[PDB]
Symmetry: D2
Subunit: 489 residues, 4 copies
Amino acid sequence: SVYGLQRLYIAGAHADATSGKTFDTFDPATGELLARVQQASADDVDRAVASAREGQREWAAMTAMQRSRILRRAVELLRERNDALAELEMRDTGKPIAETRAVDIVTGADVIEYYAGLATAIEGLQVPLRPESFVYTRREPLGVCAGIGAWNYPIQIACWKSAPALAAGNAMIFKPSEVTPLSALKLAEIYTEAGVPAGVFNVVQGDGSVGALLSAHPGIAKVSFTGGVETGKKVMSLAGASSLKEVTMELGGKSPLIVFDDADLDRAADIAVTANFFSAGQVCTNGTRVFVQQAVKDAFVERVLARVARIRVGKPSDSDTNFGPLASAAQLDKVLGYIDSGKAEGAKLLAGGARLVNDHFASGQYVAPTVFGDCRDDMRIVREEIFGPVMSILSFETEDEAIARANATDYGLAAGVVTENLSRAHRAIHRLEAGICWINTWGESPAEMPVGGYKQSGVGRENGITTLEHYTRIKSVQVELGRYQPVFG
Amino acid sequence: SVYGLQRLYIAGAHADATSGKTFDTFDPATGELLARVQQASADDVDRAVASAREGQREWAAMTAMQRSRILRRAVELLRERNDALAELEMRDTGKPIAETRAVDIVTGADVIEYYAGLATAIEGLQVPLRPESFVYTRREPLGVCAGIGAWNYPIQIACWKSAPALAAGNAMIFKPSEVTPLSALKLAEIYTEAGVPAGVFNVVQGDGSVGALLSAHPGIAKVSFTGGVETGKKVMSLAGASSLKEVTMELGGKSPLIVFDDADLDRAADIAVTANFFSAGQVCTNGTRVFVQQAVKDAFVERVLARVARIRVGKPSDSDTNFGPLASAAQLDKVLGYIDSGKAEGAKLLAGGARLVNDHFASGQYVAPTVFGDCRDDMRIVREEIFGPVMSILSFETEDEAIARANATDYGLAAGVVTENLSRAHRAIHRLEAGICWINTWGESPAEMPVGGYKQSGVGRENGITTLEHYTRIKSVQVELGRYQPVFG
Amino acid sequence: SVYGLQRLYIAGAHADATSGKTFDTFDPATGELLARVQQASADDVDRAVASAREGQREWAAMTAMQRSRILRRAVELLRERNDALAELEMRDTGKPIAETRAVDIVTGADVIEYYAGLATAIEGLQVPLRPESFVYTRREPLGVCAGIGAWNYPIQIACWKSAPALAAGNAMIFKPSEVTPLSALKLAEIYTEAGVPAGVFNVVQGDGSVGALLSAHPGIAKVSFTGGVETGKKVMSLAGASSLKEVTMELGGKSPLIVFDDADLDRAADIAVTANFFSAGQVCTNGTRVFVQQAVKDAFVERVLARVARIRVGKPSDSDTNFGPLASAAQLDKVLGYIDSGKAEGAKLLAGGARLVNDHFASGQYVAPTVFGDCRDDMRIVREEIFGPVMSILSFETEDEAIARANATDYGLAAGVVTENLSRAHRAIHRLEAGICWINTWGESPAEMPVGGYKQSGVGRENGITTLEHYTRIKSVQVELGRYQPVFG
Amino acid sequence: SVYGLQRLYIAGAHADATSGKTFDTFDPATGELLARVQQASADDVDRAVASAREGQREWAAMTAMQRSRILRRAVELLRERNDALAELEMRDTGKPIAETRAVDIVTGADVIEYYAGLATAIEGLQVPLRPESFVYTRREPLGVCAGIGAWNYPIQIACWKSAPALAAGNAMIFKPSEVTPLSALKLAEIYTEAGVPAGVFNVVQGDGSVGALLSAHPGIAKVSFTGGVETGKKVMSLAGASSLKEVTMELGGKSPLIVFDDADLDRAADIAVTANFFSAGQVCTNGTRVFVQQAVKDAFVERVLARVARIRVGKPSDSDTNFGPLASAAQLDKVLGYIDSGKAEGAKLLAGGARLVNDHFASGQYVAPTVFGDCRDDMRIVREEIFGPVMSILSFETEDEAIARANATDYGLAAGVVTENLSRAHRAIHRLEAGICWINTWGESPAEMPVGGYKQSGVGRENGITTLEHYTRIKSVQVELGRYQPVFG
Ligand code: NA
Ligand code: NA
Ligand code: NA
Ligand code: NA
């Protein structure tokens, strides 16, 4: 294989699993075997929890500034190793090197950097009740937290979940997607090199059954999961039924992008293209229902198709590429099935729509950037998250209509509008039922900005100050300075 | 029956159920039939949700100060009707009238009053990213929330769950315990009289199957449950598996009270007695493992037994009573079984230990205030929440020992210490794994103080500013004022 | 006189001064003597401070909710007495009854109501340093605060200064403007009737020399002053030189209103008219430099002049009036001098410009709503706050030009823009150097919104949560639980 | 001289003054001339302001994380250069090298480090008013701030004032004490080397007349001063009278240390010694009134005198020294005058009391660690800040007495108690009128802990999150999305 035998990371070192099982990860651009990975057993998860409990104690006994400095050093190492990590991530995911070099590690490190600086600002409250009694709260570490990653942003998700957990004094056991197991181990090495105590970031490997081992474990105080809605429901159910864990869920969406008749149409078309085809369409927040007001529909669609024809589909290892293969053959089968469904249900195929099989593309999982026009709300491609490069374009007449149809979904992750008008921009966004809202842009996710889903697109949030607060638990302390007045007298 | 036929409260009025089923509520002091209550059907819950969705829209369209004033009026009505509500609550629960007159409605109204004044202070954030772009958040209502009450504090729990929900602009569908269905309807009437729109506080009735209808309903954004750990696990699992609802769980405990050798022993004994026998021992936060340092053990136990002998066991309708019956025969059977278990496992019976059956007591569910000495950590009465008036007293030698044994539990609701020493008071409390901690007192739960469980004693919190914040969901809005830089160029 | 002999309010009652001096207040619409008012002596201010210190102790010893309820009752009394107070305020100020009935008491009570509900939410922090030591803060009352009011909003300013002071547990000694001494006494009566302890709101009377007695007094912890810039500088200097008091200053302005070429011009003209002639032009935040982009200048000026001709100038006691006299003859002389200055320096007189002297107007201090066109940045009427009904209209070519000229002032109180464009609205406001900024509106001052000046227009803020916080002082408490390590060993 | 000709630091380089004036700084241990320093003229201050305005614009245009990284680099350079800076600071101040090596730069860098990490967490608010209108605030830089340092902690004060100013996007012009002008220039060099733009930290030099130039300058938005009460009053008066600047004042104190009869007396004596003789008694927060309860008075005084006799008085360049000379001959004359006053007014001289003149001590400004017993509240040494190594010990009988006498002062900087009792520790501290309160310790000033004075000991605060917030000014923005309803219709 390219990268050899891979295993677990427990107690500050790589470690053999005890399952007797392995799984393979491939390069989806070529079919090359990247690595054979040992799968964690139930005993291994138990050992990862004992290791995390030990490391968490040492980590939490440090001052907040000592934790800050160690996380700041981890940032330095991620910045130094950006290009090496970006190549590994490109191989494992199939995403273009132009993306992994500029986004995945950069923004992963950005969030660790943000929380490293905030580690000193976790404060409880104090409030008097009367001269003789007052309350103060402590914001204590939860303890051992579990993170379960997705394959579309492997190391970035590892960074985003581990950063607030560690900055708040927790340990984290992280399980990457079995589709993309490699880069999370490099993050574990970097945390150790930066000075993170043994066990504070452990990595276990395997499929959803290993995820279930984490979600069910009685020694884990909180589980944070990123993935599909239906898997997230099983994770949350098990996390609650097993031991009443706290939970964060970052799930899929069918996010609406509303292009109004007073939108900058060049800006709108750029936005729609970014919102549908970045990372080969494999982004939870993608604006995959593109609502366009009738009077600008033709002019907008023309601009969209012109930009789509300029997408550079190619080998993800080529820095000129800005669109590569999907992450797996299962992904490809699903996306092509949706394209078949769209065609059969009468949507108009305006661009793409087929697997690329010429020359080197045959050895990979390549689906062309695809655009459907004249879509209807009752179509499968409009109702369901595809998680691939398929834009559905829908005409509308009025603002109330667009808002009603945008909201008529059980998803609620993101939403966005394009309009030059002050009143319309804010009033439309205020009525959209989504946790992540963009005006005249799309896709940026600053470390300061809490992100998460309404409805079935998630529970809780990531990033922002609030997420650091939610990696602590509140202890309320009432101090009685006066005489205790007997109740039974 | 005493109080007649009772039913549902939907859309601003009492309303018939459509199940064809009823259930009875009794006075546990006398066995008198209090009421026959119609049980909500699945259709009724659907109707309660449609009604709540309609009312929530009108409620949220008001200004925060308009909501504040209406909730302040509800407070006035609760204060005026304190004694009538207290009698009803005494009849339904069996708790002494001296408690329901002074605590249940008073502190229920206290929390509504607190949140009414804070309804105007729910603020998002704003943060710039660069001159051309900034983020602001909205804290929007969740929508329709569900509350599921327990029978030990029926109207107080209805107040504590509905107050932050309504103050944040939500509607709530509330289901009281089938053991104590009556007082929640009076709160619904008061909210309507105060000006709360139809559907903003609906009441449905029935057993845990009606609770499951709420927990599973796709139109409900959040479920808040108070009850036993094992039921809470089923609620949270269903709330997550059905539609990824937000959840709050306030569950049971086995909370430790640590009496140190430098405790004020009079104060410690008063505290231990309050912490074990208020509300006939039916309080989730009760300090039911009483750890006492060896050098003061004998002097402390003597003081405890002297106070226990002065408890006034009697009819709860008599204002001289400060200890009445348990809430049900099922409660009595369970508690007596635990007393049997304690005796068989070798704990020493120091007080009580038997059902009272003389004179009027035979018609009720009365168990004497019970104290066990010389207890061991491996005993059932020490390991498991009894939810009845049974104190377990445990000797210890050292501070580290007491803290280790106090923490060696899967419960984590409350904890407390009694000591005159500054350093010891805070350092011991900081090491105890509980969300609710008391120093030289017990049991007070100010509206300012967030309360909830560590470990399997809960998820999330009630009361405090934080709980108002957690009845909103965060919408992040990024405003791009500059040119959108194309990603696909 | 109309309202008779008036005096001081100290220790919960009206009280004679000991200066041997009085001053008269008149109705500026008629010249009628309203009242003869006893002026406080230095001994009286000393007595007001001793009285406030005593009342503050009782007030602060109450719970926050007890203070909340008493302030909520004060709100009820202000709402009930709205019309009686509005007539008194109209007589004393000359402002139209249509304003005092709808604005002055309503919004004064609004801010007391807001802070009454927030009185329970004043919280310190807690932060650990290490296992053996932690910090908590207390937010303690400042003690005795001084408020010095202006004559344009007498009772509203009394409400806005006293509300956060009292809600935070302080006492306040308030001195109204000698021009408008009457309504502050009614507020003192209402606070007493609502349950505020004696001395918690005292009223002293007189000119700026009595204000200086307050600013210099060593027993006063904070002074809050609203008035002109040059007086504010003397107040702040004396407040600091005497005893290092905390200070709030709400001073005058020359606030710019920028009407862009893509403004709704009807909206812009309505805004400009409100921003210049409400309260007969006597508002610190008025938009008295009206910048209009050249391409819409003529159309905008036409709309402005049409609205100005529809202003109903009349007796302020007539509810049909929406523009009455200025507050004093000194005001009139000053404003007419500015009109003379504008004419002499070459500004074009487009409306008004003269004293009204026909019929009843001769007995009052009436100056017509005045508009100058073709103004220049170097004109006196453009550079200096007039505090009267004089709009200066200035043409501009570019957005950078308007922003540069709007900012080229030592004032910095308010600013505003009118534009339909999303990007322009926010980017222009972000560059304007003012504390109070309005987009597509003007003049609303919600209780939630902190208001105050940049540059020489003020220090500190009023309203918003932040102002409640700034009526407390921070006490930091470090608790050492471990052994103190000797420094000298 | 030892360190040569020194001058100003403006626009990223050392720069000649234009006053034609210099002043000398000496080593107070030897009388050696350390440097001849050019004094800034009025033109130089004007130039420093123009330079700061230019640098502030570039600094504020960076992202918060870009500012964070540059300040983090400044921290690295301060840590690397700790020993070189410590020697310079020892030479200039006379404080022991054991102090400057371990405290001055360490804790100065600590606060820069703290604020560097928090630079990303400065957030405004957002609050809706109604569906059609909402408010958001911006926390904008003040602009150009002035810092005026004291000679007892020259570089630490430069760090503590410049850190929150720069982290919030301001520039600062700093003037060190003319007694200790050297180390502030090294900080300016370090900021430049770390990447701080030219003009963002400028240094001007001279006596109080140069301080007055800063306090009066119309281009400076805020002045922060640390020094004596009487100078602080003049600074605040001029800062307000000139242009209504915001102000922070950290002034002197006469802080009480209360040793109760249940204090750990070893701990109390260590604390009292630290609280009186660190930095040769030249600390604003020193506990210079030591109240001791009568029953432990003799035992406590014995312990104090035993520790005082073990103080190592010596050359500050010797690392074995922990007590050196005072900072100047003016300091020495003043302190000796107070010792004379204490003796004449009848206080009992228990230790020290004289200038050391043997051997090398004759060439320095050495006063022995001095202790007075049997002091009275009416003595000059008890009433007035000495700012030298003179402890006044006062007996008391009751807790109320100690608290009353501790509070009977116009100072209010710090206070502290020593007691093993939980109730007494908190209840006594809650009643003491001081901003900085210590329980069973003294002198630690964590970056998290806001510090400042009550009464005439200061205005505003330093350190803590609150101080970062107070280096911004609030801009409130109301966005009207609906139709503007005409007021004049
Ligand atoms: Na792979
Ligand atoms: Na019942
Ligand atoms: Na008047
Ligand atoms: Na010197």
